[PDB]
Design a protein around this ligand. Structure first.
Ligand SMILES: OC[C@H]1O[C@H](O[C@H]2[C@H](O)[C@@H](O)[C@@H](O)O[C@@H]2CO)[C@H](O)[C@@H](O)[C@@H]1O
Ligand SMILES: [Ca+2]
Ligand SMILES: [Cl-]
Length: 370
């Protein structure tokens, strides 16, 4: 059961959870209510596990794509923001947290992947994926590599898979057809094949994960990485001279990252819904609230109009939105979890050589479909 008279908040370990706790700290001073912020591993799977029993955090933070599944399972309270507060956030951010005609979470920030590059190693970053193999060769002469990013999470490879025609669920008639999956079409296969060939030709390592890729880029060992605004902070610290720019094209086509809207839902079983509404609307979703979290780890382009007008100036935000525009806002339908699981297994198996690309994506096609 969930404890009354306090706030428990879950947010992913890559985000500014210390900044968020700082906002909770102020809340505690003003109200006497303790706010405990936690970042459980794989919380996107852990939340529905514990919330299914009326347990868990009062507030859950994650990209909007998971929230449809959460609402369908009856895990999320409907949020009741008045028209005034609604007018404070961008309309399209409200759209991402609308399920079955109901708002099921507070939109916080728009996230998209960008190409992050070392200006000292790479004054002009590559415009195409195709030129990366040769680039890596040059850098291998300095004992360095061209590009490292997390291969354990399909989120990071998806931009390349969707570039030439890969897609999740066919969107027709304003609705998604959940039996029409596009993870094994010619476009998907060519994208994954190119990744697998990078590994096969020693330009990348199939074991590369988030931590390895981050360490490598921040220590100057690799010229490029692929990541979101949250990662900019640790790069700032390491004082590597970096830039953020458009993802490389593939086969002449833009990489198409799946765009997420970090959102805050309220546990349906929480006895602290009023507390949570207060905290979210009048502490977090203010200039000073978002600033506090942003200082810890950049959120991207925030949904709060007032604040995002300062942030849109930053050229890193501009690159994020350019990439967001070339990609697509994730669906929030409940089948998204099966999709992500399917594509994760496929990417990993093909990367490690455990399966051919065709066999990996054929299985993923079956698993993603209902
Ligand atoms: O890799 C599958 C994964 O992709 C997305 O997760 C992102 C998340 O949106 C970002 O905030 C980032 O910080 O972490 C994840 C990448 O590791 C989907 O949102 C998620 O549901 C899905 O499992
Ligand atoms: Ca678009
Ligand atoms: Cl990882």
């Amino acid at each position: 059961k969930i404890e009354e008279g306090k706030l428990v908040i879950w947010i992913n370990g890559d985000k500014g959870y210390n900044g968020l706790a700082e906002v909770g700290h102020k809340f505690e001073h003003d109200t006497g209510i303790k706010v405990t912020v936690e970042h459980p591993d794989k919380l996107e799977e852990k939340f529905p596990q514990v919330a299914a029993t009326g347990d868990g955090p009062d507030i859950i933070f994650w990209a909007h794509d998971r929230f449809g599944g959460y609402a369908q399972s009856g895990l999320l309270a409907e949020i009741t923001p008045d028209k005034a507060f609604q007018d404070k956030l961008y309309p399209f951010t409200w759209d991402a947290v609308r399920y079955n005609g109901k708002l099921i979470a507070y939109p916080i920030a728009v996230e998209a992947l960008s190409l992050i590059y070392n200006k000292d190693l790479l004054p002009n970053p590559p415009k195409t994926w195709e030129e990366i193999p040769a680039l890596d060769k040059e850098l291998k002469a300095k004992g360095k590599s061209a590009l490292m990013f997390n291969l354990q999470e399909p989120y990071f490879t998806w931009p390349l898979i969707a570039a030439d025609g890969g897609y999740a669920f066919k969107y027709e008639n304003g609705k998604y057809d959940i039996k029409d999956v596009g993870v094994d079409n010619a476009g998907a296969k060519a994208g994954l094949t190119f990744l697998v060939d990078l590994i096969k030709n020693k330009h990348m390592n199939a074991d590369t994960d988030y931590s390895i890729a981050e360490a490598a880029f921040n220590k100057g060992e690799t010229a490029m990485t692929i990541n979101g605004p949250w990662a900019w902070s640790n790069i700032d610290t390491s004082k590597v001279n970096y830039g953020v720019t458009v993802l490389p094209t593939f086969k002449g086509q833009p990489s198409k990252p799946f765009v997420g809207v970090l959102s805050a839902g309220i546990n349906a079983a929480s006895p602290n819904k009023e507390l949570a509404k207060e905290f979210l609307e009048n502490y977090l979703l203010t200039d000073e609230g978002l600033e506090a979290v942003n200082k810890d780890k950049p959120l991207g382009a925030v949904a709060l109009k007032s604040y995002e007008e300062e942030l849109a100036k930053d050229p890193r935000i501009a690159a994020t939105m350019e990439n967001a525009q070339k990609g697509e806002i994730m669906p929030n339908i409940p089948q998204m979890s099966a999709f992500w699981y399917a594509v994760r297994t496929a990417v990993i198996n093909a990367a490690s050589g455990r399966q051919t690309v065709d066999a990996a994506l054929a299985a993923a096609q079956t698993n993603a479909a209902a």
